[PDB]
Amino acid sequence: CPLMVKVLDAVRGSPAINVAVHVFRKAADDTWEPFASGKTSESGELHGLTTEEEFVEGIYKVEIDTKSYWKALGISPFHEHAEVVFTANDSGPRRYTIAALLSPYSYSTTAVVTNP
Amino acid sequence: CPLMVKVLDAVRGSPAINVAVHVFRKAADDTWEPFASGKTSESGELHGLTTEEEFVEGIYKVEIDTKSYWKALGISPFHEHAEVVFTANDSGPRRYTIAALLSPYSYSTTAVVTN
Amino acid sequence: CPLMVKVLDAVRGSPAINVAVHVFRKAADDTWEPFASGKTSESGELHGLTTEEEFVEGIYKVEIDTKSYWKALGISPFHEHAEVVFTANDSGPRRYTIAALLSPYSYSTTAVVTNP
Amino acid sequence: CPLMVKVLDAVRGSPAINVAVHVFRKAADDTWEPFASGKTSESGELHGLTTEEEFVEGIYKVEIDTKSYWKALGISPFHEHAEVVFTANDSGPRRYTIAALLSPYSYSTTAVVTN
Ligand SMILES: O=c1cc(-c2ccc(O)cc2)oc2cc(O)cc(O)c12
Ligand SMILES: O=c1cc(-c2ccc(O)cc2)oc2cc(O)cc(O)c12
């Protein structure tokens, strides 16, 4: 699959499990349209969001619901969510891994982009 | 200075200078409305965005134009920008520093909330 | 395997390939003794460093040769290496993933620690 | 101030205060020898470690006692410490800030090298 999301908890040193993830694609009229969504699994990974056919060129937004994650663990975090916005498939189809590393007052995001 | 933004460059090991920063506040119709903006100085810092009277509780977005920065350096970037979204709450501490550390395919952001 | 190392390049958005990794274990006399070593593969991962039998409790050091990596890419980086030092297996055997995310003047390291 | 260390806490969103920091210089027999040390202030900063005359080219280690910090907060940490090792070179810029951002199972360190 062309798009995968992986989330890690920097406080517990574990995958961040059951984290909600919403993906949007920028429409011709410049609005964000719902593209796909899901929950991270026991391994902190979210697979199967889309397909090579559906994941065309465009600007995508991946919004990770970090706030609900921390609140379920009893922590009141700083951020409302982590939001990753990028142009995809601009030089042909690629595989994208979006990784986020979460702490209550900080997060980091990296993309690993490989060929098919 | 209730809100300061600081940007660092992980490739060159330097302040990220002349980086455009826009700040928005969530309006009651769920739309982002522009609030403040500027460009980081030679020290990679952006001071004077707002004041204590203006910076009321609310949900705020800080959008950092990382793509233009990397473009000025001739390095292909992954992200369109870095967007930091948070609720400002009064009972907590009085000053917010939003720090971001930039790489072409990665960024990290941290809030340092004091006083 | 109980210990795995994963290295990512934050400039190219790719796994960091052929990165040298040296693992040491603190001896009774407080010196660092050579424990294991290897190179990251095409996926930026290094598997097979040790075994459940050999990976006993102790203080371990994982030294990642980031400087040779950047220099081979034409970059003169800040750090000599990235060095991760931790107590392992103190409450029984665990699986450790040591991940490092590399930029020329910055790096981050995280541990994902799971049960067998 | 040729060398400054700054430490931030990613769990609390605050300067990491009272954190012990030791600095070593590689000696010709490959051994680390103590050079300077201190504890971070209320702003999470450690100033005055060395001087321009003393801080000659060499290989240096900055060891940050992150484990004691997390222990004082009652949070189980993964690392024994954070160890930042670098070559100081004169032709480059004149001032080094070693910044570290701490979480219990993760840290990041960046060098900001200016003037
Ligand atoms: O030099 C600084 C570095 C950082 C920083 C920014 C991002 C990181 O991942 C780690 C540290 O934050 C800061 C926050 C401040 O309020 C002031 C700083 O100098 C810094
Ligand atoms: O792609 C990955 C990226 C990371 C990672 C490493 C460092 C960061 O600051 C953020 C994410 O950890 C990982 C850990 C794994 O076990 C597997 C991964 O693919 C990743």
Experimental method: X-ray
Give the separation between CA C59 and CA C88, rounded to whole angstroms: 6
The SS3 call for residue C56 is coil
Q: What tokens were used for A23?
A: 């993906």
Of A59, A78, A85, which is closest to B83 when you measure between CB atoms? Answer: A85
Cα separation of B67 and B87, whole Å? 25
**Long-range CB contact pairs, C26-32, < 8 A, 24+:** C26/C58, C26/C59, C26/C60, C26/C61, C32/C61
Nearest-CA distance B60 → chain A (Å): 9
Return the SS3 of B88: strand
Burial of C67 (0-12, 13-18, 19+ CB in 10 A): buried
Residues A55 and D90: their CA atoms lie apart, in Å, by 50
Taking the C-alpha atoms of residue A90 and residue C64, their distance in angstroms, rounded to an integer, is 33
**Other C-beta atoms within 10 Å of A51: how many?**
11
Domains and CATH numbers, chain B: 1-115 (2.60.40.180)
Q: Closest ligand 1 atom, CA of B97?
A: 16
Rounded to whole angstroms, how far apart are CA atoms A59 and C19? 33
Q: Which residue has the tokens 């950047």?
A: C70
Give, rounded to a whole angstrom, the gap between the first and last alpha carbons of chain A. 9
Contact call for residues D24 and D33 (beta carbons, < 8 A): yes
Nearest CA to ligand 2 atom 7: C101
Distance separating alpha carbons of residues B62 and B99, to the nearest angstrom:
11
Indicate left, alpha or beta for D58 from its phi (over 0: left) and psi (-120 to 50: alpha). Answer: left
Cβ–Cβ contacts within 10 Å for residue A71, how many?
A: 12
Measure the CA–CA gap between C26 and C33, rounded to whole angstroms: 6
How would you class D13 by CB atoms within 10 Å of its CB: exposed for 0-12, middle for 13-18, buried for 19 or more?
A: buried
Residues D105/C111, Cβ–Cβ less than 8 Å: yes
Q: Which residues of B touch chain C, with CB atoms under 8 Å apart?
A: 9-14, 75, 78, 101, 103-106, 108
- Cα-trace Rg, chain A: 14
Contact C48, C38 (CB under 8 A): yes
**Angle at the Cα of A63 from the Cα atoms of A25 and A40, rounded to 5 degrees:** 115
DSSP, res B11: T
Single out the residue of D88, D75, D79 nearest to residue D49, CA to CA.
D88
Cβ atoms of residues B9 and B15 within 8 Å: yes
Torsion angles phi and psi, residue C67, rounded to 5: -65, -45
For residue C39, what are its two tokens? 């190179």
Pairing state between β C3-9 and C95-103: parallel
Resolution in A: 1.9
- For residue B108, give how far its alpha carbon lies from the nearest alpha carbon of chain D (Å): 9
What phi-psi label fits residue D67: left (phi over 0), alpha (psi between -120 and 50 degrees) or beta?
A: alpha
Distance of CA C37 to the CA centre of its chain: 9
Question: In this structure, are strands D3-9 and D95-103 parallel, antiparallel, or unpaired?
Answer: parallel
